[PDB]
Design an enzyme around this catalytic site. Structure first.
Site, PDB file in Angstrom:
ATOM      1  N   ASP A  97      43.253  32.007  52.792  1.00 32.42           N
ATOM      2  CA  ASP A  97      43.238  30.622  53.306  1.00 32.42           C
ATOM      3  C   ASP A  97      41.455  30.463  53.196  1.00 32.42           C
ATOM      4  O   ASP A  97      41.251  29.126  53.409  1.00 32.42           O
ATOM      5  CB  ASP A  97      43.499  30.416  54.504  1.00 32.42           C
ATOM      6  N   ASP A 124      48.835  26.553  57.397  1.00 35.81           N
ATOM      7  CA  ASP A 124      49.478  27.608  56.868  1.00 35.81           C
ATOM      8  C   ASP A 124      50.447  28.130  57.869  1.00 35.81           C
ATOM      9  O   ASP A 124      50.786  27.586  59.135  1.00 35.81           O
ATOM     10  CB  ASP A 124      48.514  28.862  57.260  1.00 35.81           C
ATOM     11  N   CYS A 158       6.806  57.455  29.401  1.00 37.81           N
ATOM     12  CA  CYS A 158       6.358  57.621  28.210  1.00 37.81           C
ATOM     13  C   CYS A 158       7.277  56.881  27.128  1.00 37.81           C
ATOM     14  O   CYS A 158       8.280  56.642  27.534  1.00 37.81           O
ATOM     15  CB  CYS A 158       6.301  59.089  27.803  1.00 37.81           C
ATOM     16  N   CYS A 191      10.038  59.160  25.027  1.00 42.81           N
ATOM     17  CA  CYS A 191      11.243  59.133  25.791  1.00 42.81           C
ATOM     18  C   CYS A 191      12.082  57.848  25.813  1.00 42.81           C
ATOM     19  O   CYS A 191      13.424  57.999  25.270  1.00 42.81           O
ATOM     20  CB  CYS A 191      11.285  59.381  27.211  1.00 42.81           C
ATOM     21  N   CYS A 241      53.976  35.644  41.618  1.00 37.13           N
ATOM     22  CA  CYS A 241      53.965  37.009  42.409  1.00 37.13           C
ATOM     23  C   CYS A 241      53.495  38.133  41.124  1.00 37.13           C
ATOM     24  O   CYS A 241      53.326  37.969  40.071  1.00 37.13           O
ATOM     25  CB  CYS A 241      55.700  37.036  42.244  1.00 37.13           C
ATOM     26  N   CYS A 258      55.852  39.081  38.989  1.00 39.48           N
ATOM     27  CA  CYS A 258      56.013  38.336  37.692  1.00 39.48           C
ATOM     28  C   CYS A 258      55.258  38.915  36.762  1.00 39.48           C
ATOM     29  O   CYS A 258      55.616  39.029  35.572  1.00 39.48           O
ATOM     30  CB  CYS A 258      55.251  36.746  38.246  1.00 39.48           C
ATOM     31  N   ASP A 306      44.351  31.252  58.823  1.00 32.19           N
ATOM     32  CA  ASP A 306      43.713  32.188  59.393  1.00 32.19           C
ATOM     33  C   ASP A 306      43.510  33.434  58.725  1.00 32.19           C
ATOM     34  O   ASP A 306      43.144  34.373  59.031  1.00 32.19           O
ATOM     35  CB  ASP A 306      44.646  32.556  60.737  1.00 32.19           C
TER      36      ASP A 306
HETATM   37  F1  ALF Z   1      50.848  31.872  54.627  1.00 35.97           F
HETATM   38 AL1  ALF Z   1      49.222  32.550  54.729  1.00 35.97          AL
HETATM   39  F2  ALF Z   1      47.382  32.650  54.797  1.00 35.97           F
HETATM   40  F3  ALF Z   1      49.448  33.287  56.256  1.00 35.97           F
HETATM   41  F4  ALF Z   1      48.884  31.572  53.157  1.00 35.97           F
HETATM   42 MG   LIG Z   2      48.285  33.033  57.967  1.00 36.23          MG
END
Ligand code: ALF
Ligand SMILES: [Mg+2]
Length: 872
Positions: free
Chosen positions: A732, A519, A84, A87, A14, A17, A728
């Protein structure tokens, strides 16, 4: 300050975390500051060496619950006006300034490279110095298709007349046989010219492809065609030359027909194969677009000194700078929130749409969507060190790790090439032996004996002719069309069935899938919250209370609030919401409203909505029965909110994510075929376990970062299993690219759609099962096509070799052309027949799972959090 130490930290899942680690480490004496990243697992600690030691720091981090181990800047610019050499001044000034190790400028291209310490110097300082000096500075497969198409067109242009002449000669001709010179004929001369043009132009790409293949210590279709065509062309020239020298009465038969024939079809097959393999990889571009393009750098601090606000490009920002984020704007770089409270959407990493509260002392992720107010962020990671950049690196690594797959035609040609050579050599030796020992069979079956040449020449010439005829007939013509034709047809079937397949690889790999990971949000369940249940805690009708809540919650912006309002609208006539209403809200504490339009509800005084904390601070307690219900509802990982009127408890509304109706059936169907099902998500363990129980998935993974998902995919692939990833969200995308087969939900993010090789346009999970079945039908058809591209040629080899000569069967000239048409037509018809495939009906799946499907108890489902399973 000196003696900064590097540490590697594992077991963190997290952003909270990270915040806890930083706060605790800074709290301890001796430690001055600490920086750490989430996915990279890398941290840098600055402390006084005389007070604490790196071993103590590692022990302190380990005590926090995260494993710690002890282990050990370049800028490129283009400067205008660098006409130059004097410079030299720029280089000398850069060296004089502290913190710069080296700096060089090239006059040829005006490019400059500077190496310095990021902690002391940054690109902004160099640019400012350059500007002060007086000059400005600023930070810095289709070919295969085209060449194959050109070869096919050239062969067709110079090959079609060859076939037309052959058909005219075979079907019907004495004029074409007229001899300009005794050894050659007009028809033979035309064949030689066209064949030479085809070989020189059409065969140019074949020769180099075979030449490249030889350097690979392997043989494929290109080598097979080059060897066969070259041998046939060489033999035809030699027999023509000797005939001209010998001025024979009748010109010998030439094999100029073969090279035009093979090049045309093989080039067409290769062209079709590459067209199918064509695909786009715009996923990386989509990810780059997510990062912010500018930031509002601040000067001095934010307590009592503020002078200017400067718009600075994200690339030019450096660690330690303070930036301002307006609401609705993307976070430019990772950092610590100071003197700012607002809402942050972190769907990039965790994937959920629920906003996460941000308070001073907290941390943010680059690319997160800010809202609810302005925020001041102190940058800590910039450039490639940002979390979004790390995801881009993971996606790039996954894409580059996808090695190519050898085509079945190439593998078949590998065994075919030795086979044709062996039989061609065997046919040569045996015919030479037969002629030498007997010399009578040759006379009976070959009028060539009438020539005045010596007997040894006749037996050698006939043996060479017979062997080469076997070689020419042996080489197939429709071999190149076997795979591409079926693959393209199969893709069309998928498109008609609501499945978009990018390239032919997925169709040849979905049938091999043995493990599938789904997922949770968006894929297995709807991505928007929905009201699950409503309960009553004077006793007004439930509908009236729902209408009152909807009016009070109409102006709410929380996803739960809008979900409640739409649910109330659906339950009611939702003709129009009440006019008179007052709104007041305390964020994260509750909302209060004044409603006096109860008459409108009847036609179709105070309203309070909140949680346990609101009731406790308002003098309202929680009953035993209602408290038990809340605990049971919370046990399922779903949100619950209580409604009260005039300070009196009225009822409760529970909001939960509803799993897709076909998710349970799809999971059961996959299990019935011996395919493992895994639920991997970034949500909390409680919600993941509840969703898994509803759908029946045995293996549940929660609190998973994008890097962890790739590791899990790699671990599954290490066991010789094929992994199909379904997702999605942005998080992912790296998993989809790394997975053997990537599936993206139709309603998912653009990056996920691009990364995945398969897109579910109909956003139905059952398409995953259908895609596997469709792939199985395609592969079985491809093998049948190869048989049609070989059986016809194989059956002709014995005829060419003369096995059936004593039975009265001889290799007639038209047999070679006939084999091509039969093979080409059979392959095309076989591939085209795939268009009759029909998607299995959902009723069949339900019937097949009439009794087999059964709900799974929550105690039998094991929940794993993290990669090393450090926690419960
Ligand atoms: F829970 Al997901 F992409 F919707 F890891
Ligand atoms: Mg998702």
């Amino acid at each position: 300050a000196p003696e900064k130490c590097f540490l590697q930290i594992t077991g963190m899942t997290c952003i909270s975390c990270v915040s806890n680690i930083e706060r605790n480490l800074k709290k301890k004496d001796g430690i001055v500051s600490v920086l750490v990243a989430l996915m990279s697992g890398k941290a840098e600690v600055k402390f006084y060496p005389d007070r604490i030691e790196p071993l103590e720091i590692a022990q302190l981090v380990e005590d926090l619950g995260f494993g710690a181990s002890v282990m050990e800047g370049n800028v490129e610019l283009i400067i205008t006006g660098m006409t130059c050499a004097s410079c030299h001044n720029i280089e000398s000034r850069l060296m004089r300034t502290p913190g710069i190790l080296q700096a060089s400028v090239a006059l040829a291209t005006c490019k400059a490279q500077v190496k310095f310490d990021p902690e002391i110097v940054g690109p902004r300082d160099i640019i400012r110095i350059i500007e002060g000096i007086g000059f400005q500075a600023s930070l810095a497969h289709k070919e295969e298709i085209k060449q194959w198409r050109n070869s096919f067109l050239f062969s067709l242009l110079f090959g079609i007349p060859v076939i037309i002449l052959m058909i005219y000669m075979l079907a019907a001709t004495m004029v074409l046989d007229r001899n300009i010179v005794p050894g050659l004929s007009i028809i033979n001369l035309v064949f030689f010219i066209l064949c030479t043009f085809v070989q020189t132009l059409g065969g140019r790409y074949f020769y180099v492809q075979a030449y490249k293949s030889l350097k690979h210590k392997a043989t494929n279709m290109d080598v097979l065609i080059v060897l066969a065509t070259t041998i046939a062309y060489i033999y035809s020239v030699v027999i023509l030359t000797v005939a001209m020298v010998e001025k024979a009465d009748k010109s010998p038969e030439t094999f100029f027909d073969t090279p035009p024939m093979l090049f045309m079809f093989i080039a067409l097959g290769r062209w079709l194969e590459h067209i199918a393999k064509s695909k786009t990889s715009e996923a990386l571009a989509k990810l780059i677009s997510l990062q912010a393009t500018e930031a509002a750098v601040v000067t001095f601090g934010a307590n009592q000194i503020i002078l200017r606000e400067e718009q600075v490009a994200v690339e030019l920002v450096q660690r330690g700078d303070i930036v301002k984020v307006v609401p609705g704007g993307k976070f430019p770089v990772d950092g610590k929130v100071i003197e700012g409270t607002s809402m942050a959407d972190e769907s990039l990493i965790t994937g959920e749409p629920m906003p996460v509260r941000k308070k001073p002392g907290s941390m943010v992720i680059a690319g997160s969507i800010n809202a609810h107010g302005t925020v001041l962020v102190e940058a800590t990671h910039v450039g490639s060190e940002t979390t979004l950049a790390q995801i881009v690196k993971l996606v790039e690594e996954a894409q580059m790790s996808k090695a190519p797959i050898q085509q079945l035609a190439d593998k078949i040609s590998g065994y075919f090439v030795p086979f044709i050579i062996i039989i061609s050599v065997v046919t040569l030796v045996t015919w030479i032996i037969i002629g030498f020992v007997n010399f009578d069979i040759i006379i009976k079956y070959f009028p060539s004996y009438s020539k005045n040449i010596s007997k040894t020449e006749v037996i050698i010439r006939v043996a060479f002719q017979t062997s080469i005829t076997v070689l020419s007939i042996a080489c197939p013509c429709a071999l190149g069309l076997a795979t591409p034709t079926a693959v393209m047809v199969g893709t069309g079937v998928a498109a008609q069935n609501g499945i978009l397949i990018k390239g032919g690889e997925p169709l040849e790999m979905a049938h091999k899938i043995k493990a599938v990971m789904f997922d949770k949000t968006g894929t297995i369940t709807h991505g928007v919250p929905k009201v699950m249940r409503v309960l009553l805690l004077v006793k007004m009708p439930l509908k009236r209370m729902l209408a009152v809540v909807g009016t009070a919650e109409a102006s709410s912006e929380h996803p739960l609030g809008m979900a409640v309002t739409k649910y109330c609208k659906e339950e009611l006539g939702t003709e129009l919401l009440g006019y008179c209403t007052d709104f007041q809200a305390v964020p994260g504490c509750g909302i209060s409203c004044k409603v006096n339009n109860i008459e409108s509800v009847l036609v179709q005084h105070t309203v309070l909505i909140g949680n346990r904390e609101w009731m406790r601070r308002n003098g309202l307690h929680i009953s035993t029965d209602v408290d038990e219900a809340m605990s049971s509802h919370e046990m399922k990982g779903q949100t619950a909110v209580l409604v009260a009127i005039d300070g009196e408890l009225c009822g409760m509304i529970a909001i939960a994510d509803t799993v897709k109706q076909e998710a349970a059936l799809a999971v059961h169907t996959l299990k019935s075929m011996g395919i493992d099902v895994v639920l991997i998500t970034g949500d909390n363990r409680k919600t993941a376990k509840a969703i898994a129980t509803q759908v029946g998935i045995k293996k549940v993974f929660a609190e998973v970062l994008p890097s962890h998902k790739v590791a899990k995919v790699q671990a599954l692939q290490s066991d010789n299993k094929r992994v199909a990833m379904v997702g999605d969200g942005v998080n992912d995308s790296p998993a989809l690219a790394r997975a053997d087969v990537g599936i993206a939900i139709g309603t998912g993010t653009d990056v996920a759609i691009e990364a995945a090789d398969i897109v579910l346009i109909r956003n139905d999970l059952l398409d995953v099962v259908a895609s596997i079945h469709l792939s199985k039908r395609t592969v079985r058809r491809i093998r049948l096509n190869f048989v049609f591209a070989l059986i016809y040629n194989l059956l002709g080899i014995p005829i060419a070799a003369g096995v059936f000569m004593p039975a009265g069967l001889v290799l007639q000239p038209w047999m070679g052309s006939a084999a091509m048409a039969a093979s080409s037509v059979s392959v095309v018809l076989s591939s085209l027949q795939l268009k009759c495939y029909r998607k299995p009906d959902s009723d069949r799946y339900e019937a097949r799972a009439q009794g087999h499907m059964k709900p799974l108890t929550p105690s039998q489902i094991s929940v794993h959090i993290g990669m090393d399973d450090r926690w419960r």
